[PDB]
Amino acid sequence: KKSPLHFAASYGRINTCQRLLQDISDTRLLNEGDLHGMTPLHLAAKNGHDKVVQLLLKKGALFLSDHNGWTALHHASMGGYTQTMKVILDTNLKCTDRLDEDGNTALHFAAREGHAKAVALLLSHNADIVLNKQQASFLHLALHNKRKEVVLTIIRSKRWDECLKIFSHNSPGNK
């Protein structure tokens, strides 16, 4: 019964997820793995279904890690879905500062893919700005992809002076 739950969470079937989660006996099926190690929290957050991820957080789910170290917030920022992002950030504030195997945060992905409202949503909250494994900030990673709107809304923000300070003086690429 694992793969029907993975399908119904990956494609936003809320009533099928309610009928599968009617029995609250075994929670190991709720936080089960995958071939790629994604629990249905990651599946519901990857495709951007806010009501499904809200139901899985109401029934109790753990912010586990991908084999690439990602979280549900990493997938919601990779897709740029602000609704699932707002649902995740209203539950636990300790999910924001989270690193993958490459050392990227969710703000790095949201700035890399050019989603302005996702960057503004993580930026209105405390985003814990940090460098990459290659000592790149999210602003560097936004500038290397010529994403005009996200660096414009970083300029229009209030935390511009904090973003301007941090960079490595030793990297030839990330100046």
Binding site: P4, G12, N47, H49
Partner: peptide, 16 residues
């Protein structure tokens, strides 16, 4: 709209 189609579609005899 297509994501809404997949969200509201009825699946019998194609499950699992």
């Amino acid at each position: 709209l297509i994501k809404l189609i997949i969200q509201k579609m009825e699946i019998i005899s194609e499950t699992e």
